[PDB]
Design an enzyme around this catalytic site. Structure first.
Site, mmCIF file in Angstrom:
data_model
loop_
_atom_site.group_PDB
_atom_site.id
_atom_site.type_symbol
_atom_site.label_atom_id
_atom_site.label_comp_id
_atom_site.label_asym_id
_atom_site.label_seq_id
_atom_site.Cartn_x
_atom_site.Cartn_y
_atom_site.Cartn_z
ATOM 1 N N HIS A 233 104.985 -21.035 -14.319
ATOM 2 C CA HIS A 233 105.425 -22.309 -14.912
ATOM 3 C C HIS A 233 106.046 -23.221 -13.852
ATOM 4 C CE1 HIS A 233 107.191 -24.780 -18.310
ATOM 5 N NE2 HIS A 233 107.994 -25.117 -17.317
ATOM 6 N N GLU A 234 106.964 -22.669 -13.055
ATOM 7 C CA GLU A 234 107.645 -23.422 -11.990
ATOM 8 C C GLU A 234 106.703 -23.735 -10.825
ATOM 9 O OE1 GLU A 234 110.863 -24.400 -12.670
ATOM 10 O OE2 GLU A 234 110.500 -23.312 -14.532
#
Ligand SMILES: CC(=O)N[C@H]1[C@H](O[C@@H]2[C@H](O[C@]3(C(=O)O)C[C@H](O)[C@@H](NC(C)=O)[C@H]([C@H](O)[C@H](O)CO)O3)[C@@H](O)[C@H](O[C@H]3[C@H](O)[C@@H](O)[C@H](O)O[C@@H]3CO)O[C@@H]2CO)O[C@H](CO)[C@H](O)[C@@H]1O[C@@H]1O[C@H](CO)[C@H](O)[C@H](O)[C@H]1O
Ligand SMILES: [Zn+2]
Length: 1293
Positions: A233-234
């Site tokens: 996600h990051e």
């Protein structure tokens, strides 16, 4: 091609290559260093807390929060060398997890290669500048002398440990201070070093409540998240930042006026695009064009800027190397002069890949990790995962969801009720939440009653200012104005295909000259700490008092249930309830005689009460209304007390909302024309541009209303489901605590005997509470839809119809002005098409687009996709609709899963629990009534025995049905007859009855997977196909409206044989009658070549007994002459039955063969893939003997080599290495087998040659020969074999 992940211990010495002493960007010039580790190309890991722009006291747990969900604080995390090695090892494992799936491997490749530009908006135009903390970090190296050398290094990512809040990860580009303003090179195309603050041990939790899909054995439960997916996600934020496309505008700000309104930070468009799914449509289509254009200008500036470059501060930097790398990164072309320029076709493909390609949801599917369905889905307390480095808890190929521990199925490895080893509850000291008080004035029997509500239980209501009004303003059509795109999306599957094709591009050396320029300014830490709580004062009971009243006490005490909310709030021993029947039976102190009956009567009352459904004729597109919502949550109209159904008839679905938004829209300005200088050519173009921008207003305004709906309306209907789920659970918890008390009071002889049936009835409560949620979620899903499609969209249409008439005046006055230019022929023809277009409204779509025509014949794959309205797929043992319309699916306890044509299939047995139900979505509710449609599925039914044709031969049972009253369609079986039935409102009936073939070895209803397809043309006939060929037909004309059940049911109904079963796979509905050419493509789409298949159509497996039958001579079995000698063909025995009209060759005679891996690895799979190298054994006297060819052994024509079972002559080598393949005949379930020697030369495909050995009789003897390789396009060939295992569904009579 494979990406390398490095290994190290934190204690390993500095080597000035993979382990350095880094001065990080916000410490430049201060001579402060940290031990850093190179995980891969252009990515570093620094095991330290993200302390930049902070103070020590920020790391301690505060008293309360200002905004958001719960936050965990611990200042001692990542302090010691021991802690740091732990962190380093967990990260390496998570990077290895990401690498081992090709989706994740593609993500890492983009990030590595997307190097920042050596320069930004405020750097020199003629020069590449590596002297900035935006692109480079200093590092201190030693000699053997001991003296030091300050060098520097270029990079893409630097990963740190978490800041103050351990469970909130962060990604940020380096910020520059320019003219006393913050400048972000990661926001205008150049890119920069991206800095992550990450923590793998502490993770968020989510739940299962709202989901459309529902299993009754899984039920409802909480799940925790996989750190690898949090990391990915990051890494998506890092990717956006590196291409310089970080979005920081058009935020969705929460309103915070009322009690019920949730207090969060503003939600960036960055976050929503990264998460993905439906909530990326909170950003309206006009805002997406703004962002696309911004980046297009930013890149054009860079294409100009790059052209001017002829120098660099680093003498060693090869200028031409970086130029070609940035041309690749930015997808620039060259004009003939030699300058860089933006190709806009190549830009659109690059822009959509980055912003809309990788998302959390889509990665989740590829990794078999469970995700939340919405961005507004409820979070609970985070948990700790303290054993990520134990491979028995979390491994680098399946994470928590490991198949060998039965934890892959239903995502059970993430399930908090099942996998209790894998997590621990977080310590109470460090966890902090936003609580709001709610105090009510109460009369003494001091002054008030006050409760605390959690911020996570409140509802998100969007600000009105957060949504665009650009579609209402003036818009000037011209000759040269362009078409805007209305689709911003990109396929992860395409990204994988692109990644697999692209040729490797090596980067330059990342060492550069020191960093001396600039001043470091770390952004100050925005504290979320607080000292006080917000107290609200309201005199009336809200929903939050009505839920708090239903709470039980934590004490082993007698309880009573009441219909008075004010009493239950005061008295600790009393509880609010909204089921009258249940209230009576529990309050009466239980009977000493017939205690079991009293407990049994509690369940019957809870079942009757909680299962109540109804409809309202005036609300025609809401299939299910649950009446008891009003009493449970205090949703009630005045003069309708105890009458929630009347209150819903009068007010509409808007009664369910806690905030009514204003639905009226401003006037949409008419299209204006600015084209004075006009030729005849440029007029017709300006007419086409005027019509296109008119079409773009309808879609823009439609998607604006949908955005507003998602943020202001849909979020309220979502919380009502959680509020109902909480309420139903409160009621179950109470009833169980009543029975637990009354059991300990009960004094009788058989107390120990019935004990487990009391626990069996307490379980039945949760079963019936889950069945209630099925109705409640359908109610809120369809109510929320009705308010959008009717109330809100009618306002858009009203203004859009007015926009049409006003713009038609402006178009036909521009035509009037320049009417003369080719009038007689074109002015009349041009005017005729305009009147056709503007008269027709453009329909609103809530889900997928209802396009059941598709430009005559565009493309057969597109025609099939576009016309699909229902498509059942099975993923990780979950059955769901993947068509686009997302119809709810209910899987009942005894619906079983078995091997299918491409994955797994549905398996139905003859009891009432073996059932699958599809509740049709409202968008596709009545598509069967007057229009054409097609139903297709794979079917597998067992061979009916001669006994069961006598017993059950006249019994017709349906297997799939939409029928009520009785109108709809149905698939039914009767002996060996397949039956399609079609029945209308007036009782008209039309059937197709297909008599199956007598030869059961070649029959369609005799234990083999076969592809069914049934088309329905209302102006002619309905056609039945099996495997793409027409088998039967019936006339459908003279037939009225068909009025179905709202559910399509997959079940055995009215079948007398209790041992009957069937299997159904890939169930599908199209909204048109497919032609034979479309069917053939559909049929062959399922026939992959990855996995080989047995005679029945199921996946071929290792370590399984199979009888061989050659396809070319299907009436033959394989026999052995003797051990160490040859194999040959013999006539197989047969069965005939004259009066019942059946006959077949008997199965299960001949040799038993066994397939094993030639080079065994440590696989979980037992499936044989095409191209696998194998060893073939014969199983004789329960002993295994190898099949092979001996060196220079007997062979026909010197080339057809005679095979030998268990040959072991002392000296002579035996060639036994075989390869299982599928070279031909894709519709047949056959396989070929290639034999090799010791030096990898082909000895041929396995088949037979007629001849004689010794004085034996003439026999078709088994051989291997390369002869077959020149004949693979023949219709019949002797190297094709069926593999036939024993099966429950075929027994010889
Ligand atoms: C019909 C037959 O006997 N086929 C077997 C073959 O026999 C050879 C000759 O047949 C061809 C062929 O049809 O494949 C004839 C082609 O013109 C040749 N093509 C070329 C050179 O381009 C091929 C080729 O030489 C081979 O395939 C090599 O790879 O062979 C056959 O006519 C010939 O028969 C007589 C001939 O008429 C006459 O001069 C005299 O009587 O002597 C010959 C032998 O009695 O013999 C040729 C070689 O003996 O040989 C191949 C070798 O792999 C096969 O044995 C083939 O039989 C098939 O075998 C299959 C699996 O092993 C399977 O049983 C099929 O059903 C068989 O037809
Ligand atoms: Zn995020």
């Amino acid at each position: 091609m494979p990406i390398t992940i490095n290994n190290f211990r934190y204690s390993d010495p500095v080597n000035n290559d993979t382990i350095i002493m880094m001065e990080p960007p916000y410490c430049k010039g201060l001579d402060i260093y940290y031990k850093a580790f190179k995980i891969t190309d252009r990515i570093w890991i620094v095991p330290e807390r993200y302390e930049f722009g902070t103070k020590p006291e920020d790391f301690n747990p505060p008293s309360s929060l200002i905004e958001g969900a719960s936050e965990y604080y611990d200042p001692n995390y990542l302090r010691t060398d021991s802690d740091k090695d732990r962190f380093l090892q967990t990260m390496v494992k998570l990077f290895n997890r990401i690498k081992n799936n090709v989706a994740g491997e593609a993500l890492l490749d983009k990030i590595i290669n997307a190097i920042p530009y050596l320069g930004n908006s405020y750097s020199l135009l003629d020069k590449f500048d590596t002297n900035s903390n935006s692109v480079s970090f200093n590092l201190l190296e030693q000699d053997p002398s001991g003296a030091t050398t300050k060098s520097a290094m270029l990079t893409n990512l630097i990963i740190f440990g978490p800041g103050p809040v351990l469970n909130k990860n962060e990604v940020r580009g380096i910020v520059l201070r320019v003219d006393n303003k913050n400048y972000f090179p990661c926001r205008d195309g150049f890119g920069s070093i991206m800095q992550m603050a990450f923590c793998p041990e502490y993770v968020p939790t989510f739940d299962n409540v709202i989901e459309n899909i529902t299993s009754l054995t899984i039920g409802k439960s909480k799940y925790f998240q996989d750190p690898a997916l949090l990391l990915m996600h990051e890494l998506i934020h890092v990717l956006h930042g590196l291409y310089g496309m970080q979005v920081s505008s058009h935020e969705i700000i929460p309103s915070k006026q009322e009690i019920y309104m949730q207090h969060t930070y503003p939600i960036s468009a960055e976050e929503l695009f990264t998460f993905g799914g439906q909530d990326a449509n909170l950003i309206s289509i006009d805002i997406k064009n703004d962002l696309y254009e911004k980046t297009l200008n930013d890149y054009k500036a860079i294409a100009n800027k790059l052209s001017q470059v002829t120098s660099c501060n680093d003498p060693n930097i090869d200028i031409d190397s970086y130029k070609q790398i940035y041309q690749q990164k930015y997808q620039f072309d060259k004009d003939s002069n030699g300058q860089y320029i933006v190709n806009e076709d190549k830009f659109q493909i690059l822009y959509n890949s980055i912003m809309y390609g990788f998302t959390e949801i889509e990665l989740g599917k590829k990794f078999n990790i469970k995700t939340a369905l919405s961005f507004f889905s409820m979070n609970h307390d985070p948990v700790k995962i303290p054993n990520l480095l134990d491979d028995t808890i979390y491994n680098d190929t399946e994470g928590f969801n490991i198949e060998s521990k039965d934890l892959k199925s239903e995502y059970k490895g993430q399930n908090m009720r099942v996998n209790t080893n894998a997590f621990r509850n977080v310590d109470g000291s460090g966890l902090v939440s936003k609580l709001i008080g709610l105090c009510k004035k109460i009369i003494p029997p001091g002054g008030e009653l006050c409760i605390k509500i959690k911020n996570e239980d409140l509802t998100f209501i969007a600000e009105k200012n957060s949504f665009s009004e650009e579609p209402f303003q003036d818009e000037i059509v011209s000759y040269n104005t362009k078409n805007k795109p209305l689709n911003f999306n990109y396929s992860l599957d395409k990204i994988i295909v692109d990644y697999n094709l692209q040729s490797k591009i090596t980067l330059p050396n990342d060492r550069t000259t020191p960093v001396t320029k600039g001043i470091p300014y770390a952004p100050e830490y925005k504290s979320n700490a607080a000292s006080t709580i917000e107290i609200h004062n309201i005199d009336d009971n809200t929903i939050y008092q009505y839920l708090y009243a239903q709470k039980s006490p934590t004490t082993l005490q007698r309880i009573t249930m009441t219909n008075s909310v004010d009493d239950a709030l005061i008295n600790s021993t009393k509880i609010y309830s909204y089921f009258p029947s249940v209230i009576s039976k529990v309050n009466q102190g239980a009977q000493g005689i017939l205690f079991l009956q009293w407990v049994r009567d509690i369940i019957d009352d809870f079942t009757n009460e909680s299962s109540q459904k109804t409809t309202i004729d005036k609300i025609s597109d809401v299939s299910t209304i649950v009446p008891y919502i009003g009493p449970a949550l205090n949703i009630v109209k005045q003069g309708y007390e105890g009458n929630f159904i009347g209150a819903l008839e009068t007010t509409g679905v808007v009664l369910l909302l806690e905030y009514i938004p204003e639905i009226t829209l401003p006037v949409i300005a008419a299209l204006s024309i600015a084209e004075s200088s006009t030729q005849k050519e440029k007029i017709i173009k300006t007419i086409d541009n005027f019509l296109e921008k008119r079409y773009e207003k309808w879609i823009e305004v439609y998607k604006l209303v949908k955005a507003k709906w998602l943020g202001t309306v849909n979020t309220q209907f979502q919380k009502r489901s959680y509020q109902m789920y909480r309420s139903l659970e409160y009621q179950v918890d109470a009833i169980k605590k009543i029975i637990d008390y009354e059991y300990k009071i009960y004094s009788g002889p058989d107390k120990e005997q019935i004990a487990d049936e009391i626990n069996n009835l307490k379980n039945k409560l949760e079963e019936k509470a889950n069945k209630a949620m099925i109705n409640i979620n359908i109610f809120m899903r369809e109510s929320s839809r009705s308010f959008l499609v009717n109330q809100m969209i009618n306002e858009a249409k009203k203004q859009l119809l007015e926009f049409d008439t006003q713009s038609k005046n402006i178009l036909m006055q521009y035509i009037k002005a320049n009417s003369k230019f080719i009038g007689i022929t074109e002015l009349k023809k041009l005017e005729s098409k305009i009147n056709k277009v503007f008269s027709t409204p453009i329909p609103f779509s809530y889900s997928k687009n209802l396009d059941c025509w598709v430009d005559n014949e565009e493309d057969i794959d597109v025609i099939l996709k576009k016309s699909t309205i229902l498509n059942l797929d099975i993923n990780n043992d979950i059955i769901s609709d993947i068509s686009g319309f997302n119809s709810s699916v209910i899987t009942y306890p005894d619906a079983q899963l078995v091997p299918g044509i491409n994955g797994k299939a549905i398996h139905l047995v003859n009891n009432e629990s073996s059932e699958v139900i599809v509740h049709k979505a409202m968008d596709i509710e009545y598509n069967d009534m007057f229009n054409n449609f097609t139903v297709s599925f794979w079917l597998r039914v067992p061979k009916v025995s001669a006994s069961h044709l006598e017993q059950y031969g006249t019994n017709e049972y349906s297997i799939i049905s939409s029928m009520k009253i009785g109108s709809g369609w149905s698939v039914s079986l009767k002996g060996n007859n397949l039956i399609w039935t079609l029945k209308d409102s007036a009782g008209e009936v039309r059937q197709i009855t297909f008599r199956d073939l007598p030869d059961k070895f070649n029959a369609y209803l005799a234990n083999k997977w076969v592809f069914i397809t049934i088309t329905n043309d209302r102006l002619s006939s309905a056609n039945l196909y099996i495997n793409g060929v027409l088998m039967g037909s019936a006339e459908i004309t003279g037939l009225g409206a068909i009025r179905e059940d709202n559910n399509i049911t997959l079940k055995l109904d009215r079948c007398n044989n209790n041992n009957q079963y069937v299997s159904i796979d890939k169930f599908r509905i199209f909204c048109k009658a497919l032609n034979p050419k479309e069917i053939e493509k559909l049929y062959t789409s399922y026939l992959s070549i990855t996995f080989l298949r047995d005679f029945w159509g199921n996946p071929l497996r290792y370590d399984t007994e199979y009888y061989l039958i050659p396809v070319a001579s299907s009436s033959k079995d394989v026999q052995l002459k003797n051990i160490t000698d040859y194999m040959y063909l013999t006539n197989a025995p047969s069965y005939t039955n004259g009066k019942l009209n059946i006959y077949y060759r008997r199965l299960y005679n001949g040799l038993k063969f066994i397939i094993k891996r030639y080079t065994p690895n440590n696989e979980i799979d037992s499936f044989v893939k095409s191209g696998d190298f194998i060893k073939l054994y014969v199983s004789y006297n329960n002993n295994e003997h190898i099949v092979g060819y001996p060196k220079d052994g007997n062979a026909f024509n010197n080339l057809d080599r005679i095979l030998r079972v268990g040959y072991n002559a002392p000296g002579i080598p035996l060639y036994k290495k075989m390869e299982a393949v599928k070279l031909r005949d894709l519709k047949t379930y056959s396989v070929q087998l290639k034999l090799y020697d010791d030096k990898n030369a082909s000895l041929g495909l396995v088949g037979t040659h007629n001849g004689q050995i010794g004085n034996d009789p003439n026999r078709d003897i088994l051989i291997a020969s390369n002869w077959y390789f020149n004949h693979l396009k023949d219709k019949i060939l002797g190297c094709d074999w069926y593999f036939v295992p024993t099966d429950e569904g075929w027994t010889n009579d």
